[PDB]
Design a protein around this ligand. Structure first.
Ligand SMILES: Nc1ncnc2c1ncn2[C@@H]1O[C@H](COP(=O)(O)OP(=O)(O)NP(=O)(O)O)[C@@H](O)[C@H]1O
Ligand SMILES: [Mg+2]
Ligand SMILES: [Zn+2]
Ligand SMILES: [Zn+2]
Lengths: 632, 227
DNA sequence: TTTTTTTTT
């Protein structure tokens, strides 16, 4: 009740590679992309083929469904047949020519095959892992193969399985043995030993018949110019939050990664994985052997919806309106968040570095959608972390020393601001954090480093992150009788590190309350924003694409803007002296002005800063200043 | 005529040695711009290097006078002389380094008609990468990396040749340790007993070894990596 | 054994 006629299966597989096609976009002909990739391997511009099983399933070929089911049910065997058919295709393409020598193993094989000269002999003398030097991987997209970590059980051993999850731990790349080669002392023969699993045992005595009969007692010595190594990496992957049952905690699983799929992940990423579930060589331990990995953080091509925007221009108002369209109003606050999503340029004049990114602090009365805005920003940004004031320690924000109980070792563990490096950290309930936890971010917000000297550890870590924070005023509500410093109960050293500080009030008004009620009740009716003016708005995906495009530019400042910027700084610094209800102003302010001007130039996708951008930065700073004195 | 080749590569030993002898005797190009830690030698106290001579021939005078036992070989000079030799040095350091040494010792003996306590040894330098960018292709190749020193170990003795003694008649034999392995004698050639020898540890020969721990520089790294 | 760190009461 088993099928072992491999030649017929090879015929089916080769017919798939010959006959799958996609029509050309101009209608000029047909592309046969799998055999194009085979020829790329033959000319050594490539190292792996990724095959989609659903293309086999939906191909217009006899026995296609049966081939797809057989691949899925015994994937560990069909990899060999795919490698054999691709090797035969490579030899049919190549003919009497030779593939180029690129590495020492290629040089050894090409030299030794013609030393042997000077197919039965080839296949008996050399193992197929050494004769074939490329990789084959499978993928699926149909929802029949979607599972959690929790559901992979005894029925799934040997089958192809697909899942989705979060990466907890990842090792560095290591060399892993695939084929060992030994040579005899006395008789100069060679032994080839392929390795499977996580162990191997080396042979001791020479097996060659002349050496054995002569009893020459020749030892075997291993050689690493002929031996084959491969990139190896290990991961631990956790369940996603939507997959977990009610009132339960997520589970984890170990994943082994080989070859070209290594270095595609680091800690703090969300991935889609396809692989084969296997035991370790009567109760057994198990792991997942990864076949294909995709970062959902990451995934010259442009979408047509983006092409329309890039041709249109003047996009600033639409981009401001497209941030969380369920939330009514707060246009200037959305513009401030839009600038914080992009930021300015890093400067490194004469060895002295200056921070390029922008920091924003939001405050307001209860029930004014601060948490909703922070949640939308966390979804919109590529790499971002979310924390609350109560749920975080000053060691969970920065970095921790971990004492391993198994070994006794000490190691470092990066916190939220380390994981968010190159991106955005959102801190909710910022006023309820302890002072001795809050003072950890002083180095990060200005020098963008974390430096540690504890136990037997002394290092520095990079933390190049923007911080967006939300809080309530000092007694839960703004008090118009108390000063700005009494309403905002933060020290001046911390206050100077924020480029923008905003206040959002809730005040009763008989028309605005009705308009807000109409908007919220429409959202509850239909599940989407009203759009009563029928104006265009941008999808979340293409807004993410546009912001990613904006980050590539580095616009330079015109030297003509000097007098405007400096005069604005002096005029700003006069009021803090001569006011009854002043605020703190320091030399960081003028750098904040330059940052916001360059940020709007990036949003415009221009390469030179304009005085219009300088004026818009000044307008936003004036709005932020006026927010802190309502009804005065 | 029997001829020696590096296994599986068709590199012959002597033809490299000819070109390296030419490099030592002839190279003088870079000496207008001699570096800060390389521009002084000595017979006693300190003295300054002269520009106009073949450079490594000038550096050999320090080995004659101050009895220094090593030469720092700047690989940029070799790459300027011949890339065809530079590629061989970087690709096969575990095979060619035991013969460029012998060319240096030959030139020293010919120039000064003199012997020394230990052989003059090569130290190639100034070939740069990152610790994370290493691959299995780079095994047994020459690399250079940088960092800070945090810890150093105590010394370990590493044997090169053992000393056996027969238990029955006090005869004694040396035995070289090579490829990580020693070979034990079975039959005593004097008294003709078998399985008879005992190793005497403190009559044998050792070398120094030390372990040093090195840490990544944090400056170059991409997003989210710890050193 | 004794020592050092981070969460909890
Ligand atoms: N202008 C608004 N438009 C739409 N929904 C709003 C608006 N103002 C408040 N809400 C709703 O009010 C609720 C509370 O939002 P939330 O983000 O928690 O407010 P908050 O500013 O965080 N208050 P707090 O966290 O206690 O300081 C959510 O369901 C919002 O949808
Ligand atoms: Mg909130
Ligand atoms: Zn043999
Ligand atoms: Zn004896």
């Amino acid at each position: 009740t088993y099928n072992t006629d491999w030649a017929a299966e090879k015929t089916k597989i080769r017919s798939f590679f010959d006959e799958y096609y996609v029509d050309n976009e101009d209608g000029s002909g047909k592309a046969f992309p799998y055999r194009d990739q085979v020829f790329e391997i033959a000319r050594r511009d490539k190292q792996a083929i990724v095959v989609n099983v659903d293309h086999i399933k939906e191909s217009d070929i006899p026995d296609a469904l049966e081939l797809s089911e057989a691949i899925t049910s015994n994937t560990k065997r069909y990899e060999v047949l795919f490698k054999d058919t691709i090797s035969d295709m490579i030899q049919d393409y190549l003919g009497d020519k030779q593939a180029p020598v690129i590495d020492a193993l290629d040089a050894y094989m090409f030299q030794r095959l013609h030393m042997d000269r000077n197919l039965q002999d080839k296949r008996k003398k050399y193992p197929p892992q050494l004769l074939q030097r490329f990789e084959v991987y499978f993928t699926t997209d149909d929802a029949a193969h979607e599972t959690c970590v929790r559901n992979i059980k005894a029925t799934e051993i040997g089958h192809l399985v697909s899942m989705k999850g979060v990466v907890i731990r990842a090792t560095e790349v290591k060399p892993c043995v695939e084929v060992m080669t030994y040579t005899c002392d006395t008789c100069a023969a060679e032994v080839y030993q392929p390795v499977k699993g996580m162990q191997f045992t080396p042979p001791v005595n020479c097996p060659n018949k002349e050496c054995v009969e002569a009893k020459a007692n020749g030892r075997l010595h291993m050689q690493l110019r002929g031996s084959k190594f491969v990139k190896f990496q290990e991961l631990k992957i956790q369940e996603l939050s939507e997959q977990v049952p009610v009132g339960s905690i997520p589970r984890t699983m170990t994943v082994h990664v080989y070859g070209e799929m290594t270095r595609k992940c680091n800690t703090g990423n969300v991935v889609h994985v396809s692989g084969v579930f296997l035991p370790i060589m009567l109760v057994a331990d198990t792991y997942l052997e990864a076949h294909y990995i995709n970062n959902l953080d990451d995934n010259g091509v442009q979408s047509a919806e983006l092409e329309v925007l890039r041709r249109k221009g003047d996009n600033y108002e639409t981009l401001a309106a497209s941030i969380a369209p369920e939330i009514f109003g707060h246009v200037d606050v959305k513009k401030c968040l839009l600038m914080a999503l992009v930021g300015g340029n890093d400067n490194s004049s004469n060895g002295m570095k200056i921070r390029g990114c922008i920091n924003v602090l939001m405050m307001g009365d209860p029930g004014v959608a601060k948490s909703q805005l922070l949640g939308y920003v966390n979804r919109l940004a590529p790499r971002s972390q979310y924390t609350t004031g109560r749920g975080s320690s000053g060691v969970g924000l920065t970095a921790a020393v971990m004492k391993d109980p198994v070994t006794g070792e000490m190691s470092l563990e990066g916190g939220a601001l380390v994981l968010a490096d190159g991106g955005i950290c959102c801190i909710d309930e910022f006023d309820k954090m302890m002072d001795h936890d809050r003072t950890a971010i002083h180095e990060v917000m200005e020098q963008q480093t974390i430096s540690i000297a504890k136990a037997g550890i002394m290092t520095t870590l990079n933390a190049r992150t923007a911080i967006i924070a939300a809080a309530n005023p000092a007694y839960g509500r703004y008090n118009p009788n108390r000063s700005i410093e009494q309403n905002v109960d933060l020290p001046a050293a911390l206050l100077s590190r924020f480029d923008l500080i905003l206040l959002m009030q809730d005040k009763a008004d008989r028309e605005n309350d009705k308009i807000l009620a109409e908007h919220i009740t429409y959202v509850h009716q239909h599940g989407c924003h009203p759009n009563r003016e029928k104006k265009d708005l941008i999808s979340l995906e293409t807004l993410r694409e546009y912001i990613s495009l904006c980050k590539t530019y580095t616009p330079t400042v015109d030297p003509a803007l000097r007098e405007r910027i400096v005069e604005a700084y002096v005029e700003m610094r006069r009021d803090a002296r001569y006011s009854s209800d002043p605020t703190f102003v320091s030399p960081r302010m003028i750098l904040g002005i330059v940052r916001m001007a360059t940020a709007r130039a990036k949003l415009r996708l221009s390469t030179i800063v304009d005085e219009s951008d300088v004026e818009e930065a000044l307008r936003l700073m004036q709005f932020a200043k006026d927010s802190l004195r309502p009804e005065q | 005529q029997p001829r020696l080749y590096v296994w599986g590569t068709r590199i012959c030993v002597a033809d490299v040695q000819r070109s390296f002898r030419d490099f030592l005797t002839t190279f003088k190009i870079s000496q207008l711009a001699e570096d800060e830690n390389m521009m002084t030698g000595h017979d006693e106290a300190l003295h300054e290097i002269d520009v106009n001579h073949p450079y490594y021939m000038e550096r050999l005078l320090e080995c004659n006078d101050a009895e220094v036992t090593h030469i720092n070989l700047n690989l940029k000079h070799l790459n300027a002389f011949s890339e065809a030799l530079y590629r061989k040095v970087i690709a096969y350091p575990a095979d060619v380094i035991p013969y460029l040494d012998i060319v240096v010792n030959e030139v020293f003996a010919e120039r000064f008609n003199r012997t020394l306590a230990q052989s003059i040894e090569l130290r190639p330098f100034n070939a740069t990468r990152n610790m994370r960018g290493l691959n299995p292709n780079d095994v047994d190749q020459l690399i250079t990396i940088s960092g800070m020193v945090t810890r150093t170990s105590s010394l370990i003795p590493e044997m090169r040749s053992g000393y056996f003694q027969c238990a029955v008649c006090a005869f004694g034999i040396e035995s070289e340790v090579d490829k990580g392995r020693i070979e034990e004698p079975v039959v005593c050639t004097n008294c003709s007993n078998t399985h008879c020898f005992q190793l005497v540890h403190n009559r044998s020969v050792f070398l120094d070894k030390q372990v040093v721990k090195l840490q990544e520089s944090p400056d170059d790294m991409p997003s989210g990596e710890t050193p």
